[PDB]
């Protein structure tokens, strides 16, 4: 099914696959009560993860893989995926991270948790970068699926025949998502040159996201 989709179809599938936007447990009518930043963020991350799994099943190509590899992809990607979602919804709120529509946090709330401000700044810098680029919703959903499919692909087994087939299938779906990205850009008026340039810009941001995710795990594990 996945390799037979046209670009318009792929975009639709991805838009339709989106998980719900979640609200925090924070009650802004009780601002002087004891609230735990990490508690609230943890509660949110854990509830998003439940929805992320169901979203992964709706990404074309994903359920064609074995169960073990489906698990592995999410295990390697989940924090990147949380982070790119944060960054996307934070685009229209410069200087702030919109963890939830009722939990919009200023940069300086990073300082409330030891070692968190560095990662906040990195998240804010990424949100800025999307803003400066006018990242479109269609492009965002393509990027989020690339993350899922690409982050664990290099660390399966290797020299086994099954992995060869699994990787081949992922690479073919990734090729389809690239075609889709280029198609959005061409449809929006960009020159070939401008198309390849923007595609490169977007994919180079993905390695920053990988970096943030690794720094994040490192910070989380240490709590």
């Amino acid at each position: 099914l996945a390799l037979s989709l046209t670009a318009d179809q792929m975009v639709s599938a991805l838009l339709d696959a989106e998980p719900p936007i979640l609200y925090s447990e924070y009650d802004p009518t009780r601002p002087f009560s004891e609230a735990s930043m990490m508690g609230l963020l943890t509660n949110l991350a854990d509830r998003e993860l439940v929805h992320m799994i169901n979203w992964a099943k709706r990404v074309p190509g994903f359920v064609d893989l074995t169960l073990h590899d489906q698990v592995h992809l999410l295990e390697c990607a989940w924090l990147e995926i949380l982070m790119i979602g944060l960054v996307w919804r934070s685009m229209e709120h410069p200087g702030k991270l919109l963890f939830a529509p009722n939990l919009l946090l200023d940069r300086n709330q990073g300082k409330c948790v030891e070692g968190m401000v560095e990662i906040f700044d990195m998240l804010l810098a990424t949100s800025s970068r999307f803003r400066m680029m006018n990242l479109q919703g269609e492009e965002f959903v393509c990027l989020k699926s690339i993350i899922l499919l690409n982050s664990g692909v290099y660390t399966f087994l290797s020299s086994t025949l099954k992995s060869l087939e699994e990787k081949d299938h992922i690479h073919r779906v990734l090729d389809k998502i690239t075609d889709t990205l280029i198609h959005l850009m061409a449809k929006a008026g960009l020159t070939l040159q401008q198309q390849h340039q923007r595609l490169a810009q977007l994919l180079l941001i993905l390695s920053h996201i990988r970096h943030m995710s690794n720094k994040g795990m490192e910070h989380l594990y240490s709590m």
């Binding site: 439940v50 799994i53 992964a56 169960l67 698990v71 999410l74 295990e75």
Partner: peptide, 15 residues
Amino acid sequence: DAFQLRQLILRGLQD
């Protein structure tokens, strides 16, 4: 901690 993640994912992918 790392077990709790695998459990969650395995639950979600199956039903």
